[PDB]
Design an enzyme around this catalytic site. Structure first.
Site, PDB file in Angstrom:
ATOM      1  N   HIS A 129      -2.453   7.058  -0.959  1.00  0.00           N
ATOM      2  CA  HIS A 129      -3.342   7.841  -0.097  1.00  0.00           C
ATOM      3  C   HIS A 129      -2.853   8.497   1.177  1.00  0.00           C
ATOM      4  CE1 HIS A 129      -6.230   4.987  -2.390  1.00  0.00           C
ATOM      5  NE2 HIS A 129      -5.855   6.010  -3.135  1.00  0.00           N
ATOM      6  N   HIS A 133       0.819  -1.211   0.000  1.00  0.00           N
ATOM      7  CA  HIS A 133       0.000   0.000   0.000  1.00  0.00           C
ATOM      8  C   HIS A 133       0.850   1.257   0.000  1.00  0.00           C
ATOM      9  CE1 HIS A 133      -2.975   2.931   0.437  1.00  0.00           C
ATOM     10  NE2 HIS A 133      -3.866   2.247   1.135  1.00  0.00           N
ATOM     11  N   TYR A 166      -0.728   7.375   3.327  1.00  0.00           N
ATOM     12  CA  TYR A 166      -0.410   6.523   4.461  1.00  0.00           C
ATOM     13  C   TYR A 166       1.095   6.488   4.607  1.00  0.00           C
ATOM     14  CZ  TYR A 166      -5.285   5.936   4.886  1.00  0.00           C
ATOM     15  OH  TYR A 166      -6.605   6.303   5.023  1.00  0.00           O
TER      16      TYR A 166
HETATM   17  C1  LIG Z   1     -15.277   2.249   0.932  1.00  0.00           C
HETATM   18  C2  LIG Z   1     -13.867   2.348   0.345  1.00  0.00           C
HETATM   19  C3  LIG Z   1     -12.786   1.704   0.888  1.00  0.00           C
HETATM   20  C4  LIG Z   1     -11.441   1.772   0.317  1.00  0.00           C
HETATM   21  N1  LIG Z   1     -10.401   1.070   0.894  1.00  0.00           N
HETATM   22  C5  LIG Z   1      -9.187   1.120   0.326  1.00  0.00           C
HETATM   23  C6  LIG Z   1      -8.042   0.358   0.882  1.00  0.00           C
HETATM   24  O1  LIG Z   1      -8.116  -0.365   1.878  1.00  0.00           O
HETATM   25  N2  LIG Z   1      -6.862   0.483   0.219  1.00  0.00           N
HETATM   26  C7  LIG Z   1      -6.656   1.281  -0.953  1.00  0.00           C
HETATM   27  O2  LIG Z   1      -5.556   1.298  -1.430  1.00  0.00           O
HETATM   28  N3  LIG Z   1      -7.715   1.972  -1.474  1.00  0.00           N
HETATM   29  C8  LIG Z   1      -8.916   1.920  -0.900  1.00  0.00           C
HETATM   30  N4  LIG Z   1      -9.985   2.613  -1.455  1.00  0.00           N
HETATM   31  C9  LIG Z   1      -9.741   3.369  -2.712  1.00  0.00           C
HETATM   32  C10 LIG Z   1     -10.251   2.400  -3.824  1.00  0.00           C
HETATM   33  O3  LIG Z   1      -9.486   1.193  -3.938  1.00  0.00           O
HETATM   34  C11 LIG Z   1     -10.372   2.913  -5.286  1.00  0.00           C
HETATM   35  O4  LIG Z   1      -9.035   3.227  -5.783  1.00  0.00           O
HETATM   36  C12 LIG Z   1     -11.238   4.142  -5.390  1.00  0.00           C
HETATM   37  O5  LIG Z   1     -12.561   3.813  -4.896  1.00  0.00           O
HETATM   38  C13 LIG Z   1     -11.368   4.626  -6.835  1.00  0.00           C
HETATM   39  O6  LIG Z   1     -12.267   3.736  -7.499  1.00  0.00           O
HETATM   40  P1  LIG Z   1     -13.762   3.715  -7.985  1.00  0.00           P
HETATM   41  O7  LIG Z   1     -14.068   5.031  -8.624  1.00  0.00           O
HETATM   42  O8  LIG Z   1     -13.912   2.504  -8.869  1.00  0.00           O
HETATM   43  O9  LIG Z   1     -14.589   3.437  -6.681  1.00  0.00           O
HETATM   44  C14 LIG Z   1     -11.296   2.584  -0.889  1.00  0.00           C
HETATM   45  C15 LIG Z   1     -12.427   3.256  -1.416  1.00  0.00           C
HETATM   46  C16 LIG Z   1     -13.687   3.183  -0.865  1.00  0.00           C
HETATM   47  C17 LIG Z   1     -14.835   3.915  -1.496  1.00  0.00           C
END
Ligand SMILES: Cc1cc2nc3c(=O)[nH]c(=O)nc-3n(C[C@H](O)[C@H](O)[C@H](O)COP(=O)(O)O)c2cc1C
Ligand SMILES: CC/C=C/C[C@H]1C(=O)C=C[C@H]1CCCCCCCC(=O)O
Length: 353
Positions: free
Chosen positions: A180, A177, A182
């Protein structure tokens, strides 16, 4: 229904994927006591396909990597054992499962830390308060302790051990990871990394931590079982960079020598991922706001090899199938993205009727 690029088989490392719709990592906060739970066996199983790539929710590598309630960990034998059943359910349907290993860094509070200690980071600057997903409560963060130079390798080691534990639980591979805001992104982003030792001061120095982790993980379980996620253009958690495109270019160019299973990059919210895809010699996974139309167009335009979906996969267990039949899609309810029910808003989204 006309065949589409998204349903096309794809070779990725030692894996033969049957389609290109990837389950993005999604923290759902339902791993009580930081231990993977039985309901996760069903959740992941509902989204498993033969030869489909699944990336699991961010998983904590150590006690200091906690910044949220009920997110799964993988640093104890109890956690490792709790993961096996989940990994088994995905494997029972022919799925490829990568465990996303994570450390929150300064995105935490002393109340989440062992013995009430301060969170750790590349810097000693804390985050300003943020409004939590429920729009009512406010998340407060503890100013982090700046890791010393010789302590960093111990942290790189936690990612290494976590990766090993992931393999032990049966995971096909791990996703580092690095996005974002982190811990890893904290070291990469110049709006955060104000270090004045070898882990800061230059693009190369800011990326040292991330690349040292890649190396330790790759060496521990093999590069073809390792992926990494980055979000150069994301500002989430006060982690932006004055030169995102260069930061991104640098990472993908540096990552080439490791022969990873893939590089997962988050789309910018003039910024583009085209130069990064061009610079990276391996499998490129893009994510961020894609739908059926955009996904196919990204493959047609050769902007990626795989396309990861987050929100649509939350509400559509059978997204790959729906995309294939060009079927309607369930809407997703953000109000239960992070709630803690074992079923509501988690395993109760319907399959194609
Ligand atoms: C509810 C939720 C939980 C997420 N948890 C993670 C995570 O644990 N790790 C990560 O790298 N991104 C996480 N993301 C970011 C997503 O993996 C993804 O990159 C982001 O939703 C963009 O995609 P989309 O437009 O298809 O939803 C999360 C997003 C959402 C909405
Ligand atoms: C977008 C970043 C995601 C990531 O990479 C790891 C976790 C995600 C952050 C969301 C955590 C949920 C917050 C819980 C507190 C609240 O209710 O707001």
């Amino acid at each position: 229904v006309d065949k589409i690029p998204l349903m096309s088989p794809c070779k990725m490392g030692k894996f033969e994927l049957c389609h290109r719709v990837v389950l993005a990592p999604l923290t759902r906060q339902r791993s009580y006591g930081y231990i993977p739970q039985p309901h996760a066996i069903l959740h992941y199983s509902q989204r498993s396909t033969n030869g489909g790539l699944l990336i699991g929710e961010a998983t904590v590598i150590s006690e200091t990597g906690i910044g949220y309630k009920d997110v799964p960990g993988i640093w104890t034998k109890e956690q490792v054992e709790a993961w096996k059943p989940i990994v088994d359910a995905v494997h029972a349907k022919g799925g490829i499962f990568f465990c996303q290993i994570w450390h929150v860094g300064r995105v935490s509070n002393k109340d989440f830390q062992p013995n009430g200690e301060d969170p750790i980071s590349c810097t000693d600057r804390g985050l300003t308060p943020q409004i939590m997903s429920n729009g009512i409560d406010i998340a407060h963060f503890t100013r982090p302790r700046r890791l010393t130079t010789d302590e960093i390798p111990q942290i790189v080691n936690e990612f290494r051990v976590a990766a090993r534990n992931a393999i032990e639980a049966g995971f096909d591979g791990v996703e580092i990871h690095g996005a974002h805001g982190y811990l890893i992104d904290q070291f990469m982003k110049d709006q955060v990394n104000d270090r004045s030792d070898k882990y800061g001061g230059s693009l190369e120095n800011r990326c040292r931590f991330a690349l040292e982790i890649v190396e330790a993980v790759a060496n521990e379980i093999g590069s073809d079982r390792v992926g990494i996620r980055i979000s150069p253009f994301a500002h989430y958690n006060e982690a932006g960079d004055t030169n995102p495109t260069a930061l991104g270019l640098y990472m993908v160019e540096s990552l080439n020598k490791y022969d990873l299973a893939y590089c997962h990059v988050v789309e910018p919210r003039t910024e583009s991922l085209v130069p990064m895809r061009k610079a990276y010699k391996g499998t490129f996974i893009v994510a961020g706001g894609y739908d059926r139309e955009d996904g196919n167009r990204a493959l047609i335009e050769d902007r990626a090899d795989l396309v990861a979906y987050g929100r649509l996969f939350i509400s559509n267990p059978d997204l790959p199938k729906r995309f294939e039949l060009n079927a309607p899609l369930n809407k997703y309810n953000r109000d239960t993205f992070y709630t803690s029910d074992p079923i509501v808003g988690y395993t109760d989204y319907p399959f194609l009727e």
